[model samples]
Target: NGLMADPMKVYKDRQVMNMWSEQEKETFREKFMQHPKNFGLIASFLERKTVAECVLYYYLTKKNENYK
Candidate 1:
């Protein structure tokens, strides 16, 4: 069995939705409460991220904040 894989490529190809930097999360959080229904615009504004992913991230973060 021979398998050659560049692990770095995996990260490079990882979707932006999965890589929520401090800035990305913060920016999204700012407008998230204001415009949740306008997902198409939000997705394009947020680095081409999808509505489902963005919404999930917001909810997830809020839940974490409350779980203390």
Candidate 2:
């Protein structure tokens, strides 16, 4: 069977951020913000997360911050 489990999801696969701890999310944030143009690198460090998810989430987070 081609089935997978996700007790901890990475970036964003198939439009899902999956599952991750708060700390990991923070780590994602720092890695991305520091290198505003290093999406590929971020994807590398993550176990499942991707450049697109990294990008989407980053902006979503920023949007919250900006709105707040």
Candidate 3:
């Protein structure tokens, strides 16, 4: 016996991550400064980005050259 599953449907419904545009990046920077440690608020400002994505990007950029 087996159960039917819809993996493709799950994929279809899932958020598709895309590269951030220059404008979005700058918005993130500005909102991040205004929010000050509030990743959720920062992500909300970006609209398309999630908190996890914003946080990871923060860490990556922070590690790169202290962009904060």
Ranking by lDDT: 2, 3, 1
Off by over 4 Å in 2: 1-23, 34-36
**Model 3 lDDT tens row, 1-68:** 23662223113212423433344455666777888888876665444566886665555555646766
The best candidate by lDDT is 2
Better of 1 and 2 by lDDT: 2
Give me the runs in candidate 1 sitting further than 4 Å from their true place.
1-16, 19-22, 33-36
**Model 1 TM-score (2 dp):** 0.45
**TM-score, per-candidate, Cα-based:** 0.45, 0.50, 0.50
Model 3, position 39, has a per-residue lDDT of: 84
Give the total clashing residue pairs for model 2: 2
lDDT of 1 at 6: 20
Candidate 2 on 27-65: residue-level lDDT in tens? 666667777878865665664567776565655654546
RMSD in angstroms, all models?
10.7, 7.2, 10.0
Q: At residue 53, what lDDT does model 1 achieve?
A: 62
- The TM-score of candidate 2 is 0.50
- lDDT for 60 (candidate 1): 60
**Model 2 worst lDDT window (10 residues):** 5-14
